[PDB]
Design a binder for this molecule. Sequence first.
Ligand SMILES: OC[C@H]1O[C@H](O[C@H]2[C@H](O)[C@@H](O)[C@@H](O)O[C@@H]2CO)[C@H](O)[C@@H](O)[C@@H]1O
Lengths: 636, 675
Amino acid sequence: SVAGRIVIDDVQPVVSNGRYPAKAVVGEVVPVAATVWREGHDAVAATLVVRYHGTTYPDLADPPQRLPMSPGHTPDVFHGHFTPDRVGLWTYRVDGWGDPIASWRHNVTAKLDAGQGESELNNDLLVGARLLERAATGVPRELREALLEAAAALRAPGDPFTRAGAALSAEVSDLLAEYPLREFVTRGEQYGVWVDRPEARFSSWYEMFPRSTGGWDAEGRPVHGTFATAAEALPRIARMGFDVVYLPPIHRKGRNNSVTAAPGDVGSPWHDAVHPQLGTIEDFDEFVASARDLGLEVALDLALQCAPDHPWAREHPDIYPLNFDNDPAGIYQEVLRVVRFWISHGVNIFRVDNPHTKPPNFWAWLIGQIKNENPDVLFLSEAFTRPARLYGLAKLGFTQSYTYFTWRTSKWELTEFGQEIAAKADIARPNLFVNTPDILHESLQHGGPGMFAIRAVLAATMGPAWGVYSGYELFENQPVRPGSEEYLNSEKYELRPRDFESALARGESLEPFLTRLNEIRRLHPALRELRTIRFHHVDNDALLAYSKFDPGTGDTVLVVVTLNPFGAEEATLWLDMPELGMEPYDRFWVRDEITGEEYQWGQANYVRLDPAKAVAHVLNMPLIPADKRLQLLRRE
Amino acid sequence: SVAGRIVIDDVQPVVSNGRYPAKAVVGEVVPVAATVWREGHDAVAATLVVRYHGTTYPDLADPPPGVPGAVKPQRLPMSPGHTPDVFHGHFTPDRVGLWTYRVDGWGDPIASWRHNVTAKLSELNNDLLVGARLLERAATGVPRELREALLEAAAALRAPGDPFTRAGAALSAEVSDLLAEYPLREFVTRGEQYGVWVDRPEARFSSWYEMFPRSTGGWDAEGRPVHGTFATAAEALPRIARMGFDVVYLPPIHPIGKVHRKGRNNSVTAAPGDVGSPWAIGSDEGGHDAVHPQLGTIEDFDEFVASARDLGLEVALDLALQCAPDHPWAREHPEWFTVLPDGSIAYAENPPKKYQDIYPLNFDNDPAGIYQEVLRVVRFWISHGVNIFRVDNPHTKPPNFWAWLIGQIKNENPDVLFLSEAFTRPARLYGLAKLGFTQSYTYFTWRTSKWELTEFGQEIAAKADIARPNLFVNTPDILHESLQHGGPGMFAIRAVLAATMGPAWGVYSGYELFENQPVRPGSEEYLNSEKYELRPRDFESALARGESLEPFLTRLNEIRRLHPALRELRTIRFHHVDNDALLAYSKFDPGTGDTVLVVVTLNPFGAEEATLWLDMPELGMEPYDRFWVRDEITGEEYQWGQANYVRLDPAKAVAHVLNMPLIPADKRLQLLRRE
Ligand SMILES: OC[C@H]1O[C@H](O[C@H]2[C@H](O)[C@@H](O)[C@@H](O)O[C@@H]2CO)[C@H](O)[C@@H](O)[C@@H]1O
């Protein structure tokens, strides 16, 4: 936000006055917006100055393209955009300037229309000549003639419409777009945007315990799985459309959180070594390779705690939390070594467990030290903490963040949530996990199969990043103690194998539905975007309705979802017609990616959802028109 | 907003990321707020660092090349609020100039330990020594008197003698208080330094009266008006003083141009002997540093200013930067004008307003030149005792110009104040305010509905850090259709709205006389405007006959003077009242705790009753509390609760200005709070 002959103000995207960069992915249309003004009726304009700086990640805590900007409905507010083409730091700046030809074009096309004579139009014409002559200076010598001829024409004697003809022409208009006469160019402030690989914003996660991939012996007793049986587990997870496979720690406490373990109990998985029963570093290397061949990524948990008997407890003075204060340099250097080790082992995704319990400046340093060395490493923060810290950690450079989504159950909670996630889109990318081996929500506990499908739609559509724990597809809703948020017989304390193949064959698996959800996502680029979520009024406290669009392709999707998993719910859906790139009186066609149903729709549309037939409607909304798709993206 | 071992974020008051300072006046309690956090359950705290830099006004915008011109750090505590991780502070600047606040964030180890050593509800525990270790450290930060408290406390928990209750000293009140004044601060993260330009109180709180000196002349025995002087104008002042207005604003007192002189009722050609527009500054007699010959001399004016000072009034001159075709600059410096190809100076305009009698100045051709001359002119009147300027459509002149001029003036003399008459888009309006314009003219004149006024009042309180408004009930160019049809009731309604809502309010003469005559039907311009003819008024007669708002405007000013609440802007809270043509709002002083509540009808014809719903904790109370009130309009007392029945007869009185129960000290500051 600057002040000169031209004033530039309230520029976006600015993050905490500029202490941190904005978040983006390669291919994302980043909308920019600034308040630009000057004196009098005189014309003003703005240029968006975008520059790439490479893959140099900045340390966030103490331990050239010239693109045009168009004005909008909101006076004195100009809007711009850009689509970064590679991972790295890009910087936008807003150049403000007076537009004398724009002014002249208007103030003279007015008089010459409509319909004044050569006498009263003589002066403005001769000034227009002075401008084209001035503008010509900015045009390379080989392209000038057009302008000079045009200028000499206005000063030649005759009829206003004939004189102004050349200056008003297309040839000139185009040429002036490429080389404009920009007066009093005021340079705005430089602002950063860290651009990440698309998997940072759009990715479907599947959490799986490798030890539970074991199966059973002919007797019925479970087998402790290896990286090999886990590698065998992968193709259905691949076939379900998940692209990230998150494993809990691969490095006492007994069955169902009991303080003393019975001999032969598995123990809780929660630093540069693999579990002997799982395999070797070589076995894991093979596991990672197997995942890559299926087009899957591996995500490891980076939990920074020690069991009382850890090598660090003895060497560098059921869990011990680490102390970052006594020997900062020491711990800082070892964590970095550990993380680098797995990066070297083909792991480019880390799920940082409870970051809010560890120093903010630590994360910043670690996130930075890694990202400079290799910018493709991504970090997800499992911070279920106050919003200050949650978003605070995201600003620090955490790629994605775990959200309040599981406790957002009501229509109103969900709208407030969806709206908030779209608002904080520049500072945080959310990961909506339907639940975790730590979180079994009371809604799912009583709602049954319908509930599981409802939540999966909500997460998969609303969240560009969504996740499922192993077993969600088998409707795992049995809670340990009544009212507890923990699972009965948690996979964390025992070998929990599952015959998914059987469930599917019997028809007791959400496995096919989760696939459709991922197919829909893959097909619809609108489900990738976050900022474009808009809610639409559906009159029924049990139904929820929201849209989304891709500013690049114009793809539009509308979701209509029941929150009652037992009985059917009907209502009238009222569409914000221009929001979807239309007029209120317009009528269009829609395809339901769920049922395959096709219908003519208007502003007001009757809707009915039977949780026996399908919990939601994922409509294929008419493609947003090019000119309307940037207007719709707009900030102010 | 910073990042370190402690994170400081979403700090307020920040203006355009810090490009411009926040607005304040001496005695104003400035609330500060920040989001401060750290890791885990460990204790965090914040310190507000206030530093004075003197009366050095900063240049806020990049000026053109060639254009020349010319302590004891407070550490104040920040308490947390209802909103987690948000700390709140405040400060009252005692001396006019630049002030800078910073938010220091830090870990509180004793706070942590205090909590962690409870635990007491037991043994074995010899962290009762890490506590001793802390108090011993903390003691270093305490002056060698009152450090004893801490040493005794530490030595106590270091003593083996008896239970873990030897730590009672460390946990004590005496210690807790002492540690508030001199805390043990870990990992002190210094936040961003943010400016606040503190002005003299007349910048925020002042009542203006606009008067044309030429119109103070009176009539001859034949009925024809007489052209007034600075002497007759000096005579018209005491009633303006008696009405409680402290600022007397005069339109240009400069020789009006003879060339292209506009005649009666905006007629393009003037009849012989027509007065002409005061805003067409400059004839053969003089320019912008000269007085109108018919008004008097520089000496006459000096006497006029002195007369105003003796009545406790201060003069506000109009700073209009245009020239009549016959101005001294038009002959001497045609490089300050936009000479068209045909060799003529461009005629002045402001869509839909055309000004055939003026030439607008050109700031681009010779920037250094014009910049230096405007300064000279403004300095001239400052030297003549004028410390207030009512700037004419500043939005028509360069932004960087204003910034440079306001700066160049305030460095030399920080007491000079500038009011922007910018009726333009909000971007530019507030934009100019951020640039350093002391007060701004508002959309107030067209905010008629209950909705419009609540949306307005709320907006003015929101933009309070970047702009101080001046609510003028009417101007010699603004005669609103509300006033044209509403009759005397309307006049009173608007005056209440302006005087209460706006810490700065204004009245243009003839208003106390209910002048509703508009030139053309539906036009906002006055029939027979004072700008083109000598419009004298016998105020004394009207008062006597019974057609003067003169006594009511005085009560409004008395009320204002008595109530420090009607000075503060940010504290405007609207209270729900069922009638849609009735409005209710509060205001409080964060220093004195004074509370005022206004209940005003917008229907000037018939009476309006309704049930008033109070946001009880906002008046520093609980919902089932029941208090007493004293109307400043009626004088008497009434029993009021959370819900109160109200009735307003515009025949009896258009509004109720209640003297609400004084807000309790501890509650005062929570009602001020930002987040
Ligand atoms: O040429 C002088 C010009 O003066 C008046 O215009 C004033 C306006 O009335 C005031 O409100 C002031 O703040 O701005 C204008 C300055 O030009 C007359 O209205 C106008 O006809 C006349 O030409």
